[PDB]
Amino acid sequence: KIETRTEPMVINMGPHHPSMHGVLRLMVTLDGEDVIDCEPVIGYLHRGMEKIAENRTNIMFIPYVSRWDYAAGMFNEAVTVNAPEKLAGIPVPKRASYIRVIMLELNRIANHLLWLGPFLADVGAQTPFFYIFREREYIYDLFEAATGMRFINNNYFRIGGVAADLTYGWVTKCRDFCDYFLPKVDEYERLITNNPIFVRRLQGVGKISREEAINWGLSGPMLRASGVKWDLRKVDHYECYDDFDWDVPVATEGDCLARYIVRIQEMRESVKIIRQALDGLPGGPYENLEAKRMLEGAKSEWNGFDYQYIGKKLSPTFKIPKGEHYVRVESGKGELGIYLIGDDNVFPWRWKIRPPDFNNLQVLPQLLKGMKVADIVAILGSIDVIMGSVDR
Amino acid sequence: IGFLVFWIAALAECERLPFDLPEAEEELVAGYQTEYAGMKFALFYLGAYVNLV
Amino acid sequence: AIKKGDLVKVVAEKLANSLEALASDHRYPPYLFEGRGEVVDIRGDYAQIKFPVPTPTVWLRLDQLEVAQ
Amino acid sequence: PAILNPIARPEVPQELAENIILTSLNDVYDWARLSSLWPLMYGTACCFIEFAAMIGSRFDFDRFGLVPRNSPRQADLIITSGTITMKMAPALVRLYEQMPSPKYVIAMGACTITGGMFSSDSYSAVRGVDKLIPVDVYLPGCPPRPEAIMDAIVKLRKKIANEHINERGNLAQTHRLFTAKHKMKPVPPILTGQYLNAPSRQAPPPALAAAM
Amino acid sequence: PIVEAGPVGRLLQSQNLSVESLGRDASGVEMIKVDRDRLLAVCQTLYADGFNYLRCQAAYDSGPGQDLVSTYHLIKLSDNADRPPEVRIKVFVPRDDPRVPSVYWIWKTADWQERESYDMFGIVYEGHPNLKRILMPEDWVGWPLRKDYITPDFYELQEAY
Amino acid sequence: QITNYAKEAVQSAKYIGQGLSVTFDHMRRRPITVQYPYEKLIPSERFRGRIHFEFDKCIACEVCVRVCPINLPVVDWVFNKELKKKELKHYSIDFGVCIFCANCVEYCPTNCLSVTEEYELATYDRHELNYDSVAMGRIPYKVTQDPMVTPIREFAYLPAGVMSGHDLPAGAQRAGERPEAIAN
Amino acid sequence: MLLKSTTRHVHIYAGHVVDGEVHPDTETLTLNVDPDNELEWNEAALAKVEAKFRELVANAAGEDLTEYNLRRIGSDLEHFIRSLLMQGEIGYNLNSRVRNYSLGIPRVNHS
Amino acid sequence: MTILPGMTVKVTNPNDTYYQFQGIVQRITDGKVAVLFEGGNWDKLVTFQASELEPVV
Amino acid sequence: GLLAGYQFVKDLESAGALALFVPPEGGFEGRYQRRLRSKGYTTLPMSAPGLGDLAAYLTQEHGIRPAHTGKEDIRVYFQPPLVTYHLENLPPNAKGLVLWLIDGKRLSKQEFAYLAQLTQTLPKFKVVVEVGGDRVVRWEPLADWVAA
Amino acid sequence: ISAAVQQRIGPEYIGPLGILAPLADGLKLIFKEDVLPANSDRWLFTLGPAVVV
Numbered sequence A: 001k002i003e004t005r006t007e008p009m010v011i012n013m014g015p016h017h018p019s020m021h022g023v024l025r026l027m028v029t030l031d032g033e034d035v036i037d038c039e040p041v042i043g044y045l046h047r048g049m050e051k052i053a054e055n056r057t058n059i060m061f062i063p064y065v066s067r068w069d070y071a072a073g074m075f076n077e078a079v080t081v082n083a084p085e086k087l088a089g090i091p092v093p094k095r096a097s098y099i100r101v102i103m104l105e106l107n108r109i110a111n112h113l114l115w116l117g118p119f120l121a122d123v124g125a126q127t128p129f130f131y132i133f134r135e136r137e138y139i140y141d142l143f144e145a146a147t148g149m150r151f152i153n154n155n156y157f158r159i160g161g162v163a164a165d166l167t168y169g170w171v172t173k174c175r176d177f178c179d180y181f182l183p184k185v186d187e188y189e190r191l192i193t194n195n196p197i198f199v200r201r202l203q204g205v206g207k208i209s210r211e212e213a214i215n216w217g218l219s220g221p222m223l224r225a226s227g228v229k230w231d232l233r234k235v236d237h238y239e240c241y242d243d244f245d246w247d248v249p250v251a252t253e254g255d256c257l258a259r260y261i262v263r264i265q266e267m268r269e270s271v272k273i274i275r276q277a278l279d280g281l282p283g284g285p286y287e288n289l290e291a292k293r294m295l296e297g298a299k300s301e302w303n304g305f306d307y308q309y310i311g312k313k314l315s316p317t318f319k320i321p322k323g324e325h326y327v328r329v330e331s332g333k334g335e336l337g338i339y340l341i342g343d344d345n346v347f348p349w350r351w352k353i354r355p356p357d358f359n360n361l362q363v364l365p366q367l368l369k370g371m372k373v374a375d376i377v378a379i380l381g382s383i384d385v386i387m388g389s390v391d392r
Numbered sequence B: 001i002g003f004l005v006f007w008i009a010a011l012a013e014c015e016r017l018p019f020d021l022p023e024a025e026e027e028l029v030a031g032y033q034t035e036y037a038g039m040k041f042a043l044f045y046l047g048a049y050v051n052l053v
Numbered sequence C: 001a002i003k004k005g006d007l008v009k010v011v012a013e014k015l016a017n018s019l020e021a022l023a024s025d026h027r028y029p030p031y032l033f034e035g036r037g038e039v040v041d042i043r044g045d046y047a048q049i050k051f052p053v054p055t056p057t058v059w060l061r062l063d064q065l066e067v068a069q
Numbered sequence D: 001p002a003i004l005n006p007i008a009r010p011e012v013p014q015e016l017a018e019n020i021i022l023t024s025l026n027d028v029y030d031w032a033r034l035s036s037l038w039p040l041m042y043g044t045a046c047c048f049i050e051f052a053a054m055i056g057s058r059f060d061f062d063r064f065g066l067v068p069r070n071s072p073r074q075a076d077l078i079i080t081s082g083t084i085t086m087k088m089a090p091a092l093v094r095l096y097e098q099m100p101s102p103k104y105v106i107a108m109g110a111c112t113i114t115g116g117m118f119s120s121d122s123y124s125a126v127r128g129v130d131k132l133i134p135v136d137v138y139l140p141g142c143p144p145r146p147e148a149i150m151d152a153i154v155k156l157r158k159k160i161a162n163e164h165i166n167e168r169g170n171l172a173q174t175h176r177l178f179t180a181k182h183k184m185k186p187v188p189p190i191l192t193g194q195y196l197n198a199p200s201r202q203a204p205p206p207a208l209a210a211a212m
Numbered sequence E: 001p002i003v004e005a006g007p008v009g010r011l012l013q014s015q016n017l018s019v020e021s022l023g024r025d026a027s028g029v030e031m032i033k034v035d036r037d038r039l040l041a042v043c044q045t046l047y048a049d050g051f052n053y054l055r056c057q058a059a060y061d062s063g064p065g066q067d068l069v070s071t072y073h074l075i076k077l078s079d080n081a082d083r084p085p086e087v088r089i090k091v092f093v094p095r096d097d098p099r100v101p102s103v104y105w106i107w108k109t110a111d112w113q114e115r116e117s118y119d120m121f122g123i124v125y126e127g128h129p130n131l132k133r134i135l136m137p138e139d140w141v142g143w144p145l146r147k148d149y150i151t152p153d154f155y156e157l158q159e160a161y
Numbered sequence F: 001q002i003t004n005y006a007k008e009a010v011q012s013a014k015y016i017g018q019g020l021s022v023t024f025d026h027m028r029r030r031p032i033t034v035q036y037p038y039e040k041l042i043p044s045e046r047f048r049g050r051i052h053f054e055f056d057k058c059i060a061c062e063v064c065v066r067v068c069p070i071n072l073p074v075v076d077w078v079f080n081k082e083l084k085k086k087e088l089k090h091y092s093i094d095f096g097v098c099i100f101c102a103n104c105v106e107y108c109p110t111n112c113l114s115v116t117e118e119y120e121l122a123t124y125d126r127h128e129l130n131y132d133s134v135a136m137g138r139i140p141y142k143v144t145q146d147p148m149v150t151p152i153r154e155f156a157y158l159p160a161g162v163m164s165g166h167d168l169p170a171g172a173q174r175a176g177e178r179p180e181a182i183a184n
Numbered sequence G: 001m002l003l004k005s006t007t008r009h010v011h012i013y014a015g016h017v018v019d020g021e022v023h024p025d026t027e028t029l030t031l032n033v034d035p036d037n038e039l040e041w042n043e044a045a046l047a048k049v050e051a052k053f054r055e056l057v058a059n060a061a062g063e064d065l066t067e068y069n070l071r072r073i074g075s076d077l078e079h080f081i082r083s084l085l086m087q088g089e090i091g092y093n094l095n096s097r098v099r100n101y102s103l104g105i106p107r108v109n110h111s
Numbered sequence H: 001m002t003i004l005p006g007m008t009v010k011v012t013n014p015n016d017t018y019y020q021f022q023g024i025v026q027r028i029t030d031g032k033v034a035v036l037f038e039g040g041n042w043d044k045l046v047t048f049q050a051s052e053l054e055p056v057v
Numbered sequence I: 001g002l003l004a005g006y007q008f009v010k011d012l013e014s015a016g017a018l019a020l021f022v023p024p025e026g027g028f029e030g031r032y033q034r035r036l037r038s039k040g041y042t043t044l045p046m047s048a049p050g051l052g053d054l055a056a057y058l059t060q061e062h063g064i065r066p067a068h069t070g071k072e073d074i075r076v077y078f079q080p081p082l083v084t085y086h087l088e089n090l091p092p093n094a095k096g097l098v099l100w101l102i103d104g105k106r107l108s109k110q111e112f113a114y115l116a117q118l119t120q121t122l123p124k125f126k127v128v129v130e131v132g133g134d135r136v137v138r139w140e141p142l143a144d145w146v147a148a
Numbered sequence J: 001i002s003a004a005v006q007q008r009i010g011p012e013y014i015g016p017l018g019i020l021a022p023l024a025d026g027l028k029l030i031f032k033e034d035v036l037p038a039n040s041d042r043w044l045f046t047l048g049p050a051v052v053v
Ligand code: SF4
Pocket: A067, D045, D046, D047, D081, D082, D083, D108, D109, D110, D111, D112, D116, D141, D142, D143, D144
């Protein structure tokens, strides 16, 4: 039966795991309340995306990609179309890059809203768990308008640009949402910084130093939550992100409270980059741009190489050129890299997905050292994992 | 004050707010109401509303 | 000998000694020997075979492959 | 033979006798199970967020009586909201066997119907959830809309009402138990609970640190 | 001889660890070929040089029946940067004895990433703590992501019928 | 103290009292929900519900097979050497294996494949999802032509300012498509 | 530990069964074919599966007792049960509540 | 006026998500006309009720 | 009302081709195919959009091409005719079978007309199509429904 | 009330406005085939919820 011994007790967190960040299994062993070790068992969602990719052309594989970081969506499609387009030297127009910045920043907000909802219920108050769904459902319809389905399987990113231009009443509908959402961002900050029962669950709980974050290898709002200031939209001048003014959010504490505040402040800078991109959009609204192509349709400043959504409509039999390559995209939860090497055929020779969720999860044994049983979910909920990006 | 002593102590023995039977902290699997299904769980389900009333 | 796009089958004596046996399991599955695998993209000494099973394709040598007419 | 994968003839007469009183006590048996069935809060892959969006305020979960019970015993319905790999395929049958017998799995998404886009070349994906558990309703999509799964609840609710009360005995599994002896060597369990205090993390071993 | 070296090849030349400098990338970073006996000598110098960030320890198959490759991309992480210097170290290893020394003691980033190289490819990492399979069942026998992997006839991996 | 303990209860039980004022004011708001089977929300103009097929327009090109992520649609064609033009005899896409990525309707030369609006495809049997050429060539269930369903619109289709589909008596999308054809 | 290989029809546990509760053993391998009655069996074909179950356990008694190796027996058993459907020996159970036809639809021979 | 299966119409009623979109119709069922809209990337056909459509010559 | 008797079975013995109108929330159609299943009738609930041409699926054998997904060849699975092969499997003690076509909102008006007359020419075989919706479960013959 | 603070409806479609939703949630538990866990006590398992309620 179930006896009562004196050695430390190992509890299996189980692959069931009723939480929204996938199927993780932790064999955390307890010392009454303190944990002394924890091994994460991953790969419950290992489907083999690096083996599929060697038998898919790029337009066959673009539907596959927005399932690793399925919280984000088009952050996976960002790296995937970037890997042959920065290897073949295919120019993306400036309008297609500006829609990519619009789509990636709305994905980073929706990635952060999907992290925040579970995390607020993990740390306490679960009444905002039902009101951050509604905030994400507005971004769901900005993706359903422009692209197809809802939040993933939205084949928007292409090699020469983007799949199609925006709809007609679209830019005026972020400006209805992104001006309504930005009041609610500060509501989320004053949920945890005020009510100081939550600050005693998040100060010093899962504290990782700056020197051990670079060694263990982290990225995004978990590296930058230790005062590292390393953002690959600023470090690599990534596709017209350098045309905007926005400050990389850091925190010099390392704890879970610092990791919380950087992510909410990354929502705030995301709407900042959004509003600088809607006004700096080359054709502006699409119906404003489509009208200029009807009044001056022969040869205008519009209908050029820019002011359009695709550079060249590439064939399905687009051969990747030969050569190694490593492409970074600053995802919502870190660096999503892929290590593309191709031969002259249309399939890549090796497609190594370097996930952000992978390298941030290997410190979770180390962060669960001295913490309590109730703090285990507060650590794992703050690393912002998506099992599926971890496992692939 | 004694109404407030009764009110916090009653809800800490019947309600759903100060209750770790939802194992959202994962201190257990689902608490003591884990292996209970069917008519025995109905006593754990509906008998926590007799205790609330 | 073996073209691109013809049904081949794998000989089990030449397979379970070489470097191709280190990657896989030694108890080879029966789809490998019934001749229905279609050869695509011969690259030098090695051929990639698309068996009618819905699993990833295998690169095997042209010595370990026999044409199944 | 003459017809591949045939249908066996039901040789029983299926005498499902029912008067006015038993049919009235059968409509309550079915209405109480369709209008309040409880899904296990389960999901592995992307399709759980299309199922968790149905918990939210825009599409109401508890409108059909769905209360998400995060334990296999208190739940009956199990919406398989995620791709089932080689791992989690023993875990899913365990969560299905740990259920009171009016179960009603519904598949969700393309990757539990036929393992949809990993059905072509992927070395560890179960191609369809009904290679493991018996399913009631299928649901195509990748992901489905939250409206699309509430149609699959409506298709499920129409299927609970067909269930007669005299067929409760066929809901139990049958044990055609066979046994055999083997000579396979038992392996020690590779996954033991120690990670940080394993005797390889404390210091780099000799014959490695000399080249460091 | 044929191809010239870069700033990391000239730095390792001055420390008497002569590496086979491959060409540039398609993105313009340096590729360096290091044998499996001089890896921890090279990595201890580059970590002391300033390459404090191991980014994407990837294992790569250079062809069926050819030598397996363990690529070590790494970058000089700082508090602020404008395309900081990066280098990819490539360690070729034969299919017979795929053993590369583990760089976990240089960068702890290669804890899962060298396990994923051992999970998919057959590359055993000497001096690795907890070298098991992460992504797969731990009792699996095959090495997927090789070109040679023959997937078994499991009933779950078949068609949906 | 005996006075410090009874006065340490008022500082919290008042703060709880102005917490219940907020939660009761959450009940003042109208439930912004979508009652599904009686108010089906309208899909977008680019929503990829399921595929439609035109058998008199498919000239056996097999571009749909080569651009599908899993090579799904079964184009069955003979060459028909008397006419020297391949006329297909059967076409079928097996939904349930479908991800609805709609690569086939995009790289279509003849505009034969096309996405519909209907997401409400869900069967008791898996093999009843294997739609024929004459089962894909049917009429999509339009949401607004149902005399049981009051269809509410979606966000990014409401007019400018409103963020809900229930207080919408009329209107259109947020901006005109050709206002500057007579204006400018 | 309970090493098990549970597909839809072939449940192979490493141990013996006393009334639902399974005790993990090292010598035995219990097997109940088709727990949910999707197939209508008979005594002629149940002996064919039970002779196949003796055949694979005796053949694979040089390997290691892992869940990978039990999943290979239950794979070859479930591949054998499906061949008993395409031979027309057993048939689908219509008294089951679900008719999803997991081992392929009924189909006639050569039209 | 009647509608022929293969000509271009445009929608006319304002209580509809497709206000003045246009394209070639397809598969005229005896009550319903499905109009392929050719919108942007993925061509989408939505049906109507053999009315609220004006042909554009 | 609640205590519905077996009047639904009597209309199916008379009309043969019924057209149900169910509430869209679901759960109240299937109480009328328990009255039908208690009276000897087996029920085969199909989905109406998945059927192709009704003559080729129901009364004829049909070549159902499975998803080969690039790895197989173009197989043709000739399934037996649905309303025929299912009539030859129910026992002669039991009565006919009833097609319970859910999602009948997306069938053509020339497909209800084929389903109406098919119950005449085939002995002991009926259909029930769940076309449309209404707040109360109400039925009518399919010959009535193709008129309006 | 929990749906009103979340701006969802609550149980419609059963009864008029959920009036039968306590009844069907309590009647499905009486109809479910309550089976004990395999290796467990029997008398202490059944009187488990009885001593609570
Ligand atoms: S079909 Fe798509 S959404 Fe559903 S589980 Fe698979 S990947 Fe996720």
